[PDB]
């Protein structure tokens, strides 16, 4: 793909609610990935709840998403429109 990001990192602020798209929910939130100094990068995610069905992301879940950087028109915004997402142990 053109346009791909993979991110392993946790759960920093809780999954907001959006909104939705013809009745499928949207959340986005901030994940924390440490670089290798250990400065960290907190970077905006969006998923949709068909995604995560199964899972739990409460503050502190580590996980690895893949997917999509998007702008679009909320102001313009940034986020990483997942496409896939695992939650992993520490």
């Known amino acids: 793909e053109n346009n791909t ?24 939130f901030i994940l924390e990935v440490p670089r290798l100094s250990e400065t960290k990068d ?5 998923i949709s709840n068909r995604l995560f069905e199964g899972m739990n992301l409460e503050v502190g879940t580590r996980v690895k998403i893949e997917g999509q950087l998007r702008s679009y028109n909320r102001k313009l915004i940034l986020t990483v429109f997942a496409r896939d997402i695992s939650v992993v142990p520490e």
């Open 5 to 28: 990001v993979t991110l392993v990192g946790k759960v920093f602020t809780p999954l907001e609610f959006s909104h939705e798209l013809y009745g499928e929910k949207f959340f986005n």
């Open 42 to 46: 907190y970077l905006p995610i969006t």
